[PDB]
DNA sequence: CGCGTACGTGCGTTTAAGCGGTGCTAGAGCTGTCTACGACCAATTGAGCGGCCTCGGCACCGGGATTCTCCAGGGCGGCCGCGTATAGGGTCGAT
């Protein structure tokens, strides 16, 4: 503190998903099932 | 690589798919009789196939007509450039 002539520099310191993820899921899910996918009776 | 958009994703609203329970009868399926139609055999006959020939419909082509294919050149505008002129500055002479 009394350095008056050349002081001392030093000494101072919702979630949604990206689009394509669900989809690729889905594709995961339903190729390892068999289920039908279209309804039975608007199919009928 | 950049722009623009269409479809993925999420949520609240809304529709009907699914379950299943119940009742009805139409139509599949079974059965029983009776026969009209098809297989099978024999004898006769011409319709269909190999062969043989002749002939013209089309393969081949040279000339002529045409129907595209490509480009090539002339014009016109722009940009650069060599030459001449004109103004400015510097130098020399005179008062």
Redesign the pocket.
């Known amino acids: 503190t009394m350095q008056t002539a050349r002081k001392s520099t030093g000494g101072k310191a919702?979630?949604?998903?990206?689009?394509?993820?669900?989809?690729?899921r889905?594709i995961r899910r339903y190729q390892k099932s068999t289920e039908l996918l279209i309804?039975?009776?608007?199919f009928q």
């Not at 919702?14 to 690729?24: E, K, M, N, Q, S």
């Open positions: 919702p979630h949604r998903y990206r689009p394509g993820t669900v989809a690729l889905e309804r039975k009776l608007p």
